[PDB]
A paper describes a structure:
Adaptor protein complex 2 α and β-appendage domains act as hubs for the assembly of accessory protein networks involved in clathrin-coated vesicle formation. The C-terminal “appendage domains” of the large subunits recruit interaction partners from the cytosol facilitating their concentration at sites of coated pit formation. We identify a large repertoire of β-appendage interactors by mass spectrometry. These interact with two distinct ligand interaction sites on the β-appendage (the “top” and “side” sites) that bind motifs distinct from those previously identified on the α-appendage.
To understand the specificity of the β-appendage top site we solved the crystal structure of β2-appendage in combination with β-arrestin P-long. Thus the peptide folds on appendage binding. Our density for D3 is not well defined but the side-chain appears to make hydrogen bonds with R834 and R879. F9 projects into a hydrophobic space lined by W841 and Y888.
Author numbering:
A (entry chain P): 1 to 14
B (entry chain A): 705 to 937
The structure:
């Protein structure tokens, strides 16, 4: 769920 | 325990016939205050004090009559506290955060200017529900993202979140990727606007990349400014 997207979406903007 | 700017000389005696004014705004439990200190450097006495605020960009207005019941004496210096709210009238001011102000007394009227530090406009319920931060983040088009460089700041992942916290910038998430920590954070203006931020902190690198996403981005340059001030002070 939510946790994941933040890593998802951090990683991406790195 | 928020961040408060030292008192700055808003209206120096030399301009208001002996009346001198030191100033600073404060946010406490989401209630705004203009912290002044009056000084009669003159040789008359001063009764009949009122302060009036011009229209500004966040509807900012005094919420009481000025709190000053005695004449002000040759040489007496006193602290005032002016409660403010933002249900007042509005005009796009430039700079966005400028307050044109009329103070009056028995002697005359003195117009002067002071800048509202925006930080004291950060409400307390500015922490985005987590779903809500993500959806919003991708929503607001990257066209709409400004980036700032927190020149020389060195304070930790952990110290950063906590200062911004007192000043109502709330950390939603802190992730690390290739060694760099990235604080995901949200704040919100008294007038309702969200600012969303990603602070990115490097191993070594003396700067701190700040990225703001915001429905009205003219605000962002100011959020920078006062994230800065916080992180320095």
């Amino acid at each position: 769920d939510d946790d994941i997207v933040f890593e998802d979406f951090a990683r991406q903007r790195l | 325990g928020g961040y408060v700017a030292p008192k700055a000389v808003w209206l120096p005696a030399v301009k208001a016939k002996g009346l001198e004014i030191s100033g600073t705004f404060t946010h406490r439990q989401g209630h705004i205050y203009m912290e002044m200190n009056f000084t009669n450097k003159a040789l008359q006495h001063m009764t009949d004090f009122a302060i009036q605020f011009n229209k500004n960009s966040f509807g900012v207005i005094p919420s009481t009559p000025l709190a000053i019941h005695t004449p002000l004496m040759p040489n007496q210096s006193i602290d005032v506290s002016l409660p403010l709210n933002t249900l007042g009238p509005v005009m796009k001011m430039e700079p966005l955060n400028n307050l044109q102000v009329a103070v009056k007394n028995n002697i005359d009227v003195f117009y002067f200017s002071c800048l509202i530090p925006l930080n004291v406009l950060f409400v307390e319920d500015g922490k985005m529900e987590r779903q809500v931060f993500l959806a919003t983040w991708k929503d607001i088009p990257n066209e709409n993202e400004l980036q700032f460089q927190i020149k020389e700041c060195h304070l930790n992942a952990d110290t950063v979140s906590s200062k911004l916290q007192n000043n109502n910038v709330y950390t939603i998430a802190k992730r690390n990727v290739e060694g760099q920590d990235m604080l995901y954070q949200s704040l919100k203006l008294t007038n309702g606007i969200w600012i969303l931020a990603e602070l990115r902190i490097q191993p070594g690198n003396p700067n701190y990349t700040l990225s703001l996403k915001c429905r009205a981005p003219e605000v962002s340059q100011y959020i920078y400014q006062v994230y800065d001030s916080i992180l320095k002070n």
